Design a protein around this ligand. Structure first.
Ligand SMILES: C[C@H](C(=O)N1CCC[C@H](C(N)=O)C1)c1cncc(F)c1
Ligand SMILES: [Zn+2]
Length: 139
């Protein structure tokens, strides 16, 4: 679990969105596993606007942060699950590192700010849903 709070927006994994998230929906994209809902209290996370390929992510299954090198956002195959059938997930970034079901929502950060959130894993790899392209999150 985990969310990004920027301005009057809450950014979560689409498969983990709550009833409240859907009742205050701003935008959702099943192919990115992203959902953005509106909030009443102001958020103070800063979003990175860059093409950084190194950063640090929070892994809740180890209660630790890990430094990672990660690939550029692209179309990557994701196995079938209880939430989605087998498909290519867009805007996805891979890194070598520990992740297990329950780690989705952990933030990935660089010196510029929030890069994305954990969305996929397994095979000794971790996948991150990029948020850097969502320029409207700051307006
Ligand atoms: C099996 C699961 C996963 O990758 N899912 C299921 C939940 C939806 C994900 C998606 N379609 O974007 C794919 C998982 C395994 N290891 C680490 C994780 F953070 C998650
Ligand atoms: Zn950066």
């Amino acid at each position: 679990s985990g969310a990004i709070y920027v301005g009057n927006y809450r950014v979560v994994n689409r498969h983990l969105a709550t009833h409240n998230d859907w009742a205050n929906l701003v935008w959702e994209d099943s192919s990115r596993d992203l959902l953005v809902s509106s909030t009443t209290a102001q958020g103070c996370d800063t979003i990175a606007r860059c093409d950084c390929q190194t950063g640090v992510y929070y892994c809740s299954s180890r209660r630790k942060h890990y430094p990672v090198s990660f690939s550029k956002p692209s179309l990557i195959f994701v196995e079938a699950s209880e939430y989605y059938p087998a498909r290519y997930q867009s805007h996805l970034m891979l890194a070598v590192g520990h992740s297990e079901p329950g780690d989705c929502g952990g933030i990935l950060r660089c010196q510029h700010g929030v890069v994305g959130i954990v969305s996929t894993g397994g095979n000794g790899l971790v996948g991150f849903a990029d948020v850097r392209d969502l320029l409207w999150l700051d307006e």
